[PDB]
Amino acid sequence: AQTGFDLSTATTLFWRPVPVHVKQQDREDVLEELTFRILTGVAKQNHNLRILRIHISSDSDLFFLHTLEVSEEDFQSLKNDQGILVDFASFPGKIISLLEKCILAQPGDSPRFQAVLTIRGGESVFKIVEINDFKQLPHITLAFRPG
Amino acid sequence: QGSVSSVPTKLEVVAATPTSLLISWDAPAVTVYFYVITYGETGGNSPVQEFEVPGSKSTATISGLKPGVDYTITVYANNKYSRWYGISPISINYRT
């Protein structure tokens, strides 16, 4: 919408399933493998605006799609809401290494990293939490959008 | 330390058509972010084709080859070692 992702000169960073606990309004909770595709690119009218794009889809439902786009300008607001201490240049690697932690996670792990997606119609909230002996601890929280 | 391998292994052709191939390989120890598959004619100096396959997949189909020519097929994995260490590919040559 805002951003203007080029998509024709995008760089692929990550494209694989991730186990996600999906929480829906009027449905029972589901543990399913969702496909994450992470790209970076630039705007179509401004090659100097870097943009991070994340698309969540499933192999079982083709019309299921949730998207997130963070421009480098957007990142400054987001970096202060969550107390993020890395720069935009390194931000995608931190997301990827958290996703990697949830791929490698095992039921008996403690701390155990876990990916969660909650869906309200036209808005979804994605978080990766670390469950330890004392609390569920969010490492990142990201607002997604249908389509 | 076989724990830290990032190169796929035992890349092989499992099925073939005059112009089509089905290749497969075993994943490395590290988590694969996605795979890059490359192919071109084994005779030098004409371009390698490339495409991406998800990190969970272990096979891919290739189209549009010349019958009776050998291609150098290469697979490598994007993974945690991709930022600061070189591309670590496995390669085979296959005819028809």
Residue numbers in the entry:
A (entry chain A): 11 to 157
B (entry chain D): -2 to 93
Quote from the publication.
Centriole biogenesis begins with self-assembly of SAS-6 proteins into 9-fold symmetrical ring polymers, which then stack into a cartwheel that scaffolds organelle formation. SAS-6 proteins contain an N-terminal globular head domain followed by a long coiled-coil, and a C-terminal region predicted to be unstructured. Moreover, SAS-6 homodimers can form higher order oligomers through a weaker interaction between two head domains from neighboring homodimers, with a ~40° angle between the two coiled-coil pairs. Here, we developed monobodies against Chlamydomonas reinhardtii SAS-6, characterizing three in detail with X-ray crystallography, atomic force microscopy and cryo-electron microscopy.
In order to identify the binding epitope of the three monobodies to their respective target, we determined their X-ray co-crystal structure. Overall, we characterized structurally three monobodies that interact with distinct regions and have different structural consequences on their CrSAS-6 targets.
